[PDB]
Design a protein around this ligand. Structure first.
Ligand code: CA
Ligand code: CL
Ligand code: MG
Length: 662
């Protein structure tokens, strides 16, 4: 069976001539994915592997579009050809299943659909046989993080030959020697175990499902589907970025009117604890006090921020909070945090309190309090909550039905279901969720638009204490790996880079100041933190103006240029909403450890309109190690016929507001 992208450049051939059902993929008539197996093994049920033959194919197609409530673009185009391939094996130990393929111009998605059939009752998948067999893997280059490690998704990216990527998380991005970029991920991860990729014979990446502590991967009763497996394929690195395939493979919004989900910017009592000027627990330096929160709320109201995150407000942080998962209360504040007074003050100032639920990995202690916790927050006019699941890989703690503790992975079926329960329960209270230590993004924000962002990668916090901090190349890695999954709460915007001393050997953001500004356009998130202490913004009002101006919700987004681990340039047009007319464009660009010159056409600007570019760029002598603060701010009239030369310093950047005139 064969299905092709609408433009014909991606062609999938599905076969039954090999040991098992298999598929392969060509791009512009060159094989990029060789014969790759399909099927399942179960704990007790007979396997779905060899001797299945194709009995039927059903072709259809789609040419449609839909609108996001919020997002990196307002209108999403869905154009694909589709084939459903049915496989059957005669008895004994026979069966039937189908695989549905969708071929877009930017990539492929496929999933299994196992129908009701005799003998398929309570089953436990122990292995998914799905492969991604990369052609010419010996000359391919990959940029990846290891899977099943103690630090979960929070690793710096490795740059290696593809054959060296032994066991990796997705999105898993690489290029072949032709320059074709490919990224493997998944979409709509619901009631199933996350896929990790396990390189078997060279270049053959086999699905490796994250298991329960008991050892099985996925429990199902009767007929079941898998999540979509996705293979993005593009001629250029930015073709991976500009695809909507992940969103397009998710089910439409199930929450109805979600106008209560509000994109915006926030600050927080947060960074002070990470650089040790405050504590999460009680005492002389406690961050989360009534007085401190009112001070942050005053600052937010004056400078245009919608909410204040406060961590350490609830009892249980005293001592070593990493170990306190059993004792956190999610309803009882410390005596120096007056929720009633702050609820009053939030209404007075118009600044929201943003809630915080750290579990330190004990999801059962959280689950038993979760209804009371969201009831309190709903009663307190809290609309957004940051959650947290701090624990080593494989060390989620649950209490089972018999009162016995078990350890689970963050990305097994158990936790996949646990995260979605939290998001669905929050939605009943009109609360949106920002998940730290999450399951990776698989596009579910389409279906549940209150799941607004997540961490799931090394963000700014690792620049406070990472030892080492994030390297100069980190952003340019995230842009083509982690960010292909969806929005990230990176908490950009550190203005005081010197709290541990300058140079290359201290814990600090290893960037220039202008690069901190560029992050607001380079790294998409519907909520963006101004992460620094308020006094550090007051020291640099002119630079701070960019953070005050920049929106977080976009009518259109375009990655103009870039290369994985080297640089990226984004242009985005603001969405008309609240304060924003919808006429301004924004640009952000960052580089890695190298200073870089990038020529950019401004032909993304609206034709026939005049703009004033407000350019925030590295000063002439800027360099991140000992001169990160040199900064130039320039205003220049431009139109779509103009061009710009970006000059990025070492670990530098540029941020631009294109203000439409008239
Ligand atoms: Ca974290
Ligand atoms: Cl960074
Ligand atoms: Mg590089």
């Amino acid at each position: 069976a064969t299905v092709q992208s609408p433009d014909g450049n991606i062609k999938i051939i599905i076969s039954d001539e090999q040991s098992t059902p298999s598929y392969s993929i060509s791009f512009k008539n060159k094989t990029v994915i060789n014969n790759s197996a399909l099927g399942f093994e179960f704990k007790q049920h007979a396997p779905f592997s060899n001797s299945f033959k194709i009995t039927k194919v059903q072709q259809q197609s789609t040419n449609t579009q839909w609108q996001q409530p919020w997002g990196e673009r307002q209108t999403v185009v869905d154009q694909h050809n589709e084939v459903t391939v049915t496989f059957a094996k005669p008895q004994p130990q026979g069966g039937t299943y189908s695989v549905r393929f969708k071929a877009f111009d930017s990539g492929v998605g496929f999933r299994y659909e196992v129908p009701k059939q005799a003998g398929l009752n309570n089953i436990e998948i122990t292995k998914e046989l799905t492969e991604f067999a990369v052609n010419n893997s010996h000359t391919a280059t990959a940029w990846w993080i290891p899977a099943r490690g103690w630090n979960k998704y929070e690793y710096v990216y490795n740059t290696t030959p593809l054959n060296d990527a032994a066991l990796v998380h997705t999105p898993f991005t690489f290029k072949n020697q032709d320059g074709v970029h490919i990224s493997i991920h998944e979409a709509a991860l619901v009631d199933y175990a996350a896929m990790v990729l396990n390189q078997r014979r060279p270049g053959v990446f086999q699905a490796d499902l994250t298991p329960w502590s008991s050892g099985v991967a996925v429990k199902k009763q009767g007929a079941f589907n898998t999540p979509w497996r996705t293979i993005q394929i593009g001629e250029k690195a930015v073709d991976l970025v500009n695809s909507d395939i992940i969103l397009n493979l998710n089910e439409p919004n199930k929450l109805g009117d979600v106008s209560w989900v509000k994109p915006g910017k926030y600050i927080g009592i947060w960074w002070g604890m990470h650089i040790n000027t405050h504590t999460w627990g009680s005492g002389d330096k406690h961050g989360a006090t009534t007085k401190n929160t009112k001070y942050y709320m005053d600052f937010a109201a004056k400078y245009g921020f919608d909410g204040v995150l406060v961590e350490g407000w609830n009892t249980g942080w005293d001592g070593d909070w990493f170990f306190n998962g059993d004792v956190f209360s999610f309803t009882q504040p410390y005596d120096d945090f007056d929720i009633a007074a702050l609820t009053k003050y939030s209404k007075q100032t118009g600044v929201q309190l943003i809630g915080h639920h750290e579990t330190s990995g004990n999801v059962s202690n959280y689950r038993k309090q979760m209804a009371d916790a969201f009831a309190l927050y709903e009663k307190s006019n809290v609309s957004q909550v940051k959650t947290g699941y701090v624990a080593d890989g494989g060390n989620i703690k649950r209490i089972d039905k018999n009162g016995i503790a078990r350890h689970e992975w963050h990305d097994g079926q158990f936790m996949v279901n646990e995260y979605l329960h939290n998001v669905k329960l929050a939605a009943k209270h009109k609360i949106s969720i920002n998940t730290h230590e999450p399951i990776k993004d698989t596009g579910l924000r389409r279906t549940y638009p209150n799941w607004i962002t997540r961490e799931g990668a090394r963000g700014q916090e690792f620049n406070a204490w990472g030892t080492p901090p994030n390297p100069p190349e980190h952003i340019s890695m995230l842009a083509f790996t982690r960010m292909l999954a969806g929005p990230m709460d990176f908490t950009p915007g550190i203005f005081d880079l010197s709290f541990n001393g300058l140079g290359a050997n201290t814990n600090r953001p290893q960037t220039t100041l202008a690069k901190q500004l560029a992050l607001y356009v380079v790294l998409y998130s519907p909520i963006q933190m101004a992460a620094d202490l308020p006094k550090n913004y007051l020291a640099k009002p002119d630079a701070f103006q960019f953070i005050q101006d920049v929106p977080t919700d976009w009518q259109q987004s375009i990655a103009l240029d870039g290369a994985v681990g080297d640089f990226i340039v984004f242009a985005r047009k603001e969405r008309k909403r609240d304060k924003y007319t919808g006429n301004d464009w924004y640009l952000g660009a960052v580089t890695d450890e190298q200073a870089r010159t990038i020529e950019i056409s401004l032909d993304f600007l609206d034709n026939g309109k005049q703009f004033e570019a407000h350019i925030y760029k590295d000063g002439k002598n800027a360099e991140w190690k000992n001169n990160p603060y040199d900064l130039t701010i320039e205003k220049r009239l431009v139109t779509a016929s103009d061009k710009l030369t970006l000059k990025l310093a070492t670990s530098g950047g540029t941020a631009i507001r294109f203000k439409a005139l008239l």
